[PDB]
């Protein structure tokens, strides 16, 4: 049982860094600052980061390095009763790969479309335009970049819903193929090659962020955007919604208990200082988000100042921000083609090494549980990515966005929250902090402070519950603009979201009815960890 290991410390770090930072740092974090009181939002964000995200982040990394197995095996060895967490986690990572990678596909599509003297999303006199098109964002109107991304790139207007996916965009299917070809030839030999691909995919975003920061700040009106970005409004701290947005952002932007840090750390040396790794990577992830904020809003202020557009219409979140709003500003500045190609290549690398982690979480968790596919890695992941691609063509259809949007709001959003919730309960109460603090001490030489133990035991479950409850309160039958999803689409969504959580009692009830003795004598066998 002594497995492979990282061919260099940096390979692991850049793998965790690469996974942890993605488009969410770019397209969610700065918008929250803007929405929830600017710099004042850093206080609930920072506190939720200190007592919520980083403890959970540290926990999984320690769990990975210590037990040295993938998600399924590690949790089974930790608590036999709650082994389904491993399965719940893996198929979540499985569901996300179905829709997440198309964001990278969209990135490459814009990357190819940027090989022109004139960027095609500048004007409103193209074949794919409507009388409602205006050169930039406006209330009651559509923008040239919005109509380019919608009526040309997506051809979403030709879909009446999710029942009507329409024809297949083969220019998009090709890009999705290229995405998986990269993903294939980065993960098929394991961390020996993956730990090298992340040297580009995790470092290029910082190369791009740097010169997009310079170009962003050199622009007229840049300082105006920084005002919109970080002008403190501490009244927000008194609001419970701000804390919930902070808590939610911190959690999903660090990705703890998702089975990927677990898998990545499982290849670490046993006596590696994983505590220093947790703190270093957590900081870099949040620092990247902070820097990305300046990158985004420097251009946002430039638009509000020299392009005469309202700040309300451009300070947005999600794919609307980098596929519509930001490229719209790029096409107006000198050397537009250069900044376009680099931006889009940033967003691509920003998602790639995250997609690596998600997939690797699956492949590692399965190789440790099933030797059949550990011996045949390349064959398995080829079948895996082929499966991804085949159904991924549905995301490449005219109504492909409707498919993407459904999974996004159901596939992993709620499932992983109650999954990680059971993780915190399992290690801090079933497995106990006592035994976990002991494990960590044997590794890095010293036990966690009383701080981490309190956080793992009391703060983390409340933190996770504070988010799950919050996403439930703000629930709303799935819609997009005017379009309202049919009831069955919403029902299917809860099935996908439910097919993960149901693994928790399913195997619990299963392994219970597989045990000799009495009811009190089932829990002890299924409570006692693997180390015996």
């Amino acid at each position, epitope marked *: 049982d002594e497995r492979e290991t990282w061919s260099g410390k940096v390979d692991f770090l850049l793998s965790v860094i690469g996974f942890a930072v993605d488009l969410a740092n770019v397209w969610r974090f700065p918008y929250l600052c803007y929405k929830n009181g600017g710099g004042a939002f850093l206080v609930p964000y920072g506190i939720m980061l200190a007592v919520g995200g980083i403890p959970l982040f540290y926990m999984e990394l320690a769990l990975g390095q210590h037990n040295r197995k993938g998600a399924i095996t590690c949790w089974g060895r930790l608590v036999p009763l709650f082994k389904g967490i491993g399965y719940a986690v893996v198929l979540i990572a499985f569901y996300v790969d179905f829709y997440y990678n198309v964001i990278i596909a969209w990135s490459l599509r814009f990357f190819f479309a940027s090989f022109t003297n004139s960027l095609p999303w500048t004007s409103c006199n193209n074949i794919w335009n409507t009388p409602n098109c205006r050169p930039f964002e406006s209330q009651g109107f559509q923008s040239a970049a919005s109509e380019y991304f919608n009526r040309y790139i997506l051809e979403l207007n030709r879909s009446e819903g999710i029942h009507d996916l329409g024809a297949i965009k083969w220019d998009m299917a090709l890009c999705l193929l290229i995405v998986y070809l990269i993903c294939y030839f980065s993960l098929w030999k394991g961390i020996s090659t993956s730990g090298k691909v992340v040297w580009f995919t995790a470092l290029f975003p910082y190369a791009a962020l740097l010169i997009l920061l310079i170009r962003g700040l050199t622009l007229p009106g840049s300082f105006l955007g920084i005002q919109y970005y970080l002008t403190p409004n501490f009244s927000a701290i008194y609001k419970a919604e701000v804390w919930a947005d902070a808590a939610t952002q911190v959690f999903f932007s660090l990705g703890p208990g998702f089975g990927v840090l677990l898998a990545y750390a499982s290849y670490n040396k046993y006596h590696n200082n994983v505590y220093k790794d947790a703190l270093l990577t957590s900081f870099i992830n949040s620092a990247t988000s902070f820097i990305a904020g300046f990158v985004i809003f420097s251009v946002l202020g430039y638009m509000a100042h020299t392009l005469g557009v309202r700040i309300e219409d451009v300070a947005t979140e999600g794919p609307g921000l980098v596929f519509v709003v930001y490229p719209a500003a790029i096409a107006t500045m000198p050397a537009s083609t250069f900044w376009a190609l680099i931006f889009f290549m940033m967003l691509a690398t920003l998602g790639l090494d995250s997609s690596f982690g998600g997939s690797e979480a699956i492949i590692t968790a399965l190789s440790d549980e099933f030797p059949k596919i550990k011996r045949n890695r390349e064959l398995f992941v080829a079948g895996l990515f082929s499966l991804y691609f085949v159904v991924g063509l549905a995301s490449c259809t005219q109504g492909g966005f409707y498919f993407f949007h459904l999974l996004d709001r159901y596939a992993a959003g709620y499932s992983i929250l109650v999954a990680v919730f059971f993780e915190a309960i399992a290690v801090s109460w079933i497995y106990g902090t*006592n035994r976990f*603090s*002991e494990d960590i001490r044997d590794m890095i030489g010293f036990p966690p402070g009383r701080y981490w133990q309190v956080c793992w035991r009391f703060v983390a479950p409340i933190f996770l519950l504070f988010i799950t409850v919050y996403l439930l309160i703000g629930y709303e039958p799935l819609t997009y603009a005017d379009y309202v999803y049919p009831s069955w689409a919403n029902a299917l969504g809860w099935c996908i979201a439910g097919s993960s959580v149901v693994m928790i009692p399913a195997v619990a009830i299963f392994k219970l009815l597989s045990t000799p003795g009495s009811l009190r004598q089932r829990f002890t066998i299924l409570t006692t960890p693997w180390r015996d």
Partner: antibody
Amino acid sequence: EVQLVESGGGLVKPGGSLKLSCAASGFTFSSYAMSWVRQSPEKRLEWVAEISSGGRYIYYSDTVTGRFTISRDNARNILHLEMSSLRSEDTAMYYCARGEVRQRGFDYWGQGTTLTVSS
Amino acid sequence: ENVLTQSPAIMSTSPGEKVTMTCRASSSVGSSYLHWYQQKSGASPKLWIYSTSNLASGVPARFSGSGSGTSYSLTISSVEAEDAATYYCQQFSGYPLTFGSGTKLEMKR
């Protein structure tokens, strides 16, 4: 406040068997890893065995391994060291010592207890 | 095992003198894993200097340590008469844990 007292020890013929103990008081004993360190006649220090805070991690020295066994009682706060197949090289002042943190070493030592192995 | 060798074995010192005893390892030791102990006659050892730089509590400022890899040392700025003891270096880098041969401080007259 912190106090460690070793008991047992004494004269033992080669091949003999004895169980050393250490009573701890003044701290959460279940929260710290204990070690046995023995001193030569010559007043040289030699580490014998380490046991973790929950006893789930055990380490022995090459001279000691296979013969001695370090134990724990977190209920009564007692550290134990059973010795068997005793040799004349095991003659030493055996110290109850505790360090949780590798980085800080053994911050507390017991008064010790003398074991003599001779024919 | 990683055997630690201390020199000198015996050191004659008058109070007020600056002295430096060395601890040499056969294998590389992490700076945060080498420690120093003082042992008075007829007493149990006390943690003196942990991680080769940090004095334990009660330890006078006159004591200090330095070193890295396979060469460390305990240095006293100004020896006092109450320093007449034996000083042991110990590594907790790898198992088995090993102590140094020891350095004994004796006074002059």
